[PDB]
Structure formats: C-alpha cells, structure tokens
Amino acid sequence: PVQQTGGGNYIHVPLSPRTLNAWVKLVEDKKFGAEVVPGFQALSEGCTPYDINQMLNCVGDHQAAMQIIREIINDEAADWDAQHPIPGPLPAGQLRDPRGSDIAGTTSTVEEQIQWMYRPQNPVPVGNIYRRWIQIGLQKCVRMYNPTNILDVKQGPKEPFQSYVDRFYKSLRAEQTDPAVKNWMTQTLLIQNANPDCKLVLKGLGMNPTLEEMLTACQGVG
Amino acid sequence: PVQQTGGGNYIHVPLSPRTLNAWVKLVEDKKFGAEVVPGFQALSEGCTPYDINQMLNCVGDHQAAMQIIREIINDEAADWDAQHPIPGPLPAGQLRDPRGSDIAGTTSTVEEQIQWMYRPQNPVPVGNIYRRWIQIGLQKCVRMYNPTNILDVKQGPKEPFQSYVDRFYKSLRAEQTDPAVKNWMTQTLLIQNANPDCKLVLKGLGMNPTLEEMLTACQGVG
Numbered sequence: 001p002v003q004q005t006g007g008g009n010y011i012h013v014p015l016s017p018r019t020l021n022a023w024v025k026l027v028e029d030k031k032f033g034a035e036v037v038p039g040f041q042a043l044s045e046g047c048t049p050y051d052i053n054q055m056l057n058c059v060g061d062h063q064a065a066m067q068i069i070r071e072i073i074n075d076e077a078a079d080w081d082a083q084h085p086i087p088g089p090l091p092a093g094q095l096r097d098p099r100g101s102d103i104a105g106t107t108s109t110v111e112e113q114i115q116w117m118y119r120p121q122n123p124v125p126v127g128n129i130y131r132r133w134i135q136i137g138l139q140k141c142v143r144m145y146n147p148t149n150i151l152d153v154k155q156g157p158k159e160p161f162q163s164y165v166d167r168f169y170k171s172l173r174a175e176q177t178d179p180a181v182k183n184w185m186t187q188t189l190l191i192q193n194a195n196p197d198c199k200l201v202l203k204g205l206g207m208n209p210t211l212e213e214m215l216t217a218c219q220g221v222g
Numbered sequence: 223p224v225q226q227t228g229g230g231n232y233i234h235v236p237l238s239p240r241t242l243n244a245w246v247k248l249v250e251d252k253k254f255g256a257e258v259v260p261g262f263q264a265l266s267e268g269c270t271p272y273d274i275n276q277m278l279n280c281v282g283d284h285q286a287a288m289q290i291i292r293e294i295i296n297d298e299a300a301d302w303d304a305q306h307p308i309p310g311p312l313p314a315g316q317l318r319d320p321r322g323s324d325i326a327g328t329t330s331t332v333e334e335q336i337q338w339m340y341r342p343q344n345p346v347p348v349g350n351i352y353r354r355w356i357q358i359g360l361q362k363c364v365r366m367y368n369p370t371n372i373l374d375v376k377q378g379p380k381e382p383f384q385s386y387v388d389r390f391y392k393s394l395r396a397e398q399t400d401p402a403v404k405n406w407m408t409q410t411l412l413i414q415n416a417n418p419d420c421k422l423v424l425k426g427l428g429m430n431p432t433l434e435e436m437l438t439a440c441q442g443v444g
C-alpha cells in the first residue's frame with residue numbers, strides 16, 4: 001500500500017502478513033467460489049500492482065485457476081498496449097507512461113507504479129486497473145468451478161422459498177450470461193423451478209411479481 | 223356474382239362449381255357447427271340472392287336444418303314487407319322496389335336483384351340482407367345441433383387451462399343467451415368449472431381477471 005510522507009512524496013508500506021494470510025485462507029476454503037471475487041477486492045483495496053502480484057504468489061499452488069487469471073491479464077494488457085500506445089519518444093529525466101505490463105507490475109518497480117498512481121498531472125490508477133483485470137480472471141474461475149447450474153437449482157418439496165431463492169441467486173452470480181437472460185431467469189425460471197405449492201401462490205400474485213412480493217407471499221408455504 | 227362491363231352496366235357470373243363444392247363439403251363435415259355460419263358468409267360474399275338459393279339447393283338433403291333456415295327467411299321477409307311496404311302505384315317502365323320475397327330471389331330475376339344491388343339512386347343490397355337472414359337460420363341450426371352445453375363444459379384434471387378455455391368459448395358461440403349472461407359466464411362460470419388447482423390460481427389473481435391474465439397464470443398448472 002502507499003502512505004504519504006513529509007515533502008508531498010509517497011512511499012510503499014508492505015501488505016500486512018495477516019492481510020495476505022486472510023487472502024490465502026479464503027482461496028483455500030471457498031475454492032474460487034463467487035465470494036472470492038469480492039473477498040479479493042476488499043483485501044486488495046489501495047494496493048499497488050506489486051502487492052497484488054504477492055497475493056497471487058501466495059495462492060500460486062492453485063495452478064489451473066492461476067493459469068486462467070494469467071491468460072486474462074495478458075489480454076487486458078495487450079488491449080491497453082493497443083488503445084493506450086506509447087505516445088512517442090519519451091523525454092529524458094521523465095518516467096515512461098505505463099504499458100499493460102507496467103499496470104501488472106511485472107516490468108515495473110513499485111515506485112514507478114506509485115509515481116503514476118499519484119502523478120500530479122495525468123495520474124494512472126495502475127493498482128485498480130490490474131485489480132479489475134484479476135476480477136475478470138477470478139470471475140471466469142468462479143464460473144468454471146461453479147458446482148450447480150442456475151437451471152438445475154429446483155426448490156425442495158419442504159425447502160423454504162427463501163433458501164431456494166438463496167441457492168437460485170448464488171448460481172446466477174456465477175452465470176456470465178447477458179443481463180437480459182439474467183432478468184428473464186429471475187422473473188420466469190425462479191417461478192418455473194419452485195415446489196408445486198409455492199408455484200401456485202406465485203402465479204396467484206399475478207404478472208411480474210417483485211422478489212420482495214414473492215418472498216412475502218411464500219413465507220411459511222410448505 | 224356480379225362483374226361490371228363497358229357502358230356502366232353489370233352482368234351475372236355464375237358462382238364457381240368449386241366455390242359451391244367447398245360449401246357442400248363444409249356442411250357435410252361440420253354438420254351445421256358454429257364454423258358453418260362464418261364459412262357460409264365467406265363463400266357467399268358478393269353473391270346475388272339467386273346464387274345464395276343455389277348454395278342452399280346444394281345442401282337441401284339436410285332437410286331438418288333447411289326447414290329451420292326456411293322458416294327464419296319467411297319471417298325476416300314478412301318484417302321487410304311490413305316495415306318496407308309497397309311505396310304505392312309504381313310508374314310504368316320502372317323496376318318495382320324489392321319485397322321480402324324479392325330479397326330472397328324466389329319471386330325475382332337475378333337481373334332485378336342486380337338492378338337493385340347497383341341502383342344509381344337508392345341501391346338495395348338484396349344479397350347482403352338475404353345472407354343476414356340465412357345467418358340467423360344457420361345460427362339457430364348451430365344452437366339446435368350444439369353437442370355440449372356451456373354449463374356441462376368442465377376442465378379435465380390434467381387438461382391444460384387453454385384447451386378447457388377453447389371448449390368453453392366454442393359452446394358460448396352456440397349460446398343465443400343475452401350478452402350480459404355471456405359476460406357473466408366468461409367471468410364467473412369459467413373460473414367455477416376449472417380443475418381444483420387452476421381454480422385456486424384464478425381466485426389468487428383477484429377480482430375480474432382478464433382472459434389473457436388467466437391464460438398466462440394457468441399455463442403449465444396441472
């Protein structure tokens with residue numbers, strides 16, 4: 001992370017060992033589950049690219065997922081090296097502008113990452129861009145390791161409607177389908193895959209029942 | 223039918239044999255079913271009374287129904303001979319105005335029917351008036367031969383709600399009851415005679431559910 005010091009300059013404070021150990025624990029227990037994507041973001045907040053590399057280096061043993069996060073990073077960096085091209089011959093005595101690889105931290109020092117992150121002129125938020133690239137990689141890992149598909153989720157005959165709602169929305173988090181497909185699933189598939197009685201109360205509510213109206217109506221049905 | 227020819231005058235083109243044979247087929251297969259009433263209208267469009275008589279003469283063997291269509295025609299002609307009385311002594315060299323019997327074509331030539339149908343002054347649409355009289359006769363035949371009464375129609379335990387709706391409305395077409403009785407049947411009897419589950423979803427919808435709302439709610443119930 002970065003702390004400001006007297007003179008208006010900034011320095012690097014290494015991520016706490018227990019901040020790194022929390023990340024490890026999460027990846028070892030949730031197995032790249034939907035929750036890992038937000039868990040990574042909260043534990044990587046205010047981090048330079050250098051620190052994000054260490055967090056990944058602490059969870060490298062999960063090689064399959066790391067290979068997926070690594071192929072997504074290279075592509076989001078290539079797109080940065082195509083749409084943010086070298087401006088031209090950089091003047092001497094000046095830091096080069098960041099390339100996709102600098103945003104990652106692989107070809108750049110943490111100080112360079114800090115100089116960009118806090119440029120008085122055109123600050124480049126290299127830490128947040130790289131966290132966004134890794135979140136695309138982790139979300140692809142959440143989908144690949146997702147244990148139950150949205151379609152398979154079906155309310156148990158006795159299962160309370162809210163727990164069936166809880167499992168239905170958790171699988172939808174993994175789904176990478178178009179947002180309209182997500183809206184049609186929450187409005188059509190969720191009434192389609194409910195136990196016989198809850199299905200009669202939901203159809204009873206009428207057309208386009210909101211989730212609050214559906215949860216309120218099926219509370220204690222079954 | 224009637225075609226216009228050079229000089230501004232009109233002539234008669236005999237109904238096609240296959241237009242007449244379609245009519246026969248329909249009456250022989252639908253057995254004066256609700257569908258016969260519209261089927262007659264489409265196959266009698268732009269016909270003089272003379273042609274409508276031939277269509278009836280092609281389906282005379284159905285004597286019982288023909289006797290009903292014939293008693294309705296005589297009464298709709300008597301009402302025309304009472305409310306459209308002979309104006310008075312007709313001038314010589316002029317076509318007499320049409321009487322109920324002329325509208326039928328029984329006491330009138332097709333040319334007279336055409337002269338009225340296309341009078342430059344007060345054209346009388348004898349072909350359409352007679353088609354309307356026969357439709358009253360066929361509709362009475364649809365009701366007399368109707369196999370299932372609106373009340374008897376009751377959704378099967380597994381029957382999809384739409385098929386029960388299809389049979390319920392087909393019997394209502396035969397019903398000659400006041401329109402309010404028709405509106406109360408479609409809004410009350412249709413929910414009353416549905417299988418136990420669909421009846422619970424329809425009551426669930428609330429008061430005065432539209433048919434679209436009822437079909438949408440019971441789709442896939444049972």
Ligand SMILES: O=P(O)(O)O[C@H]1[C@H](OP(=O)(O)O)[C@@H](OP(=O)(O)O)[C@H](OP(=O)(O)O)[C@@H](OP(=O)(O)O)[C@H]1OP(=O)(O)O
Nearest residue numbers: 223225235236237238239240241242243244264265267268
């Ligand atoms: O009504 P018909 O006396 O039996 O004649 C019909 C009629 O032709 P006309 O319009 O000249 O009367 C058909 O037209 P429609 O009345 O059905 O619209 C036409 O068929 P098209 O729709 O293609 O015009 C068909 O001609 P064909 O079946 O040879 O294609 C022809 O029937 P016939 O000549 O066989 O008697």
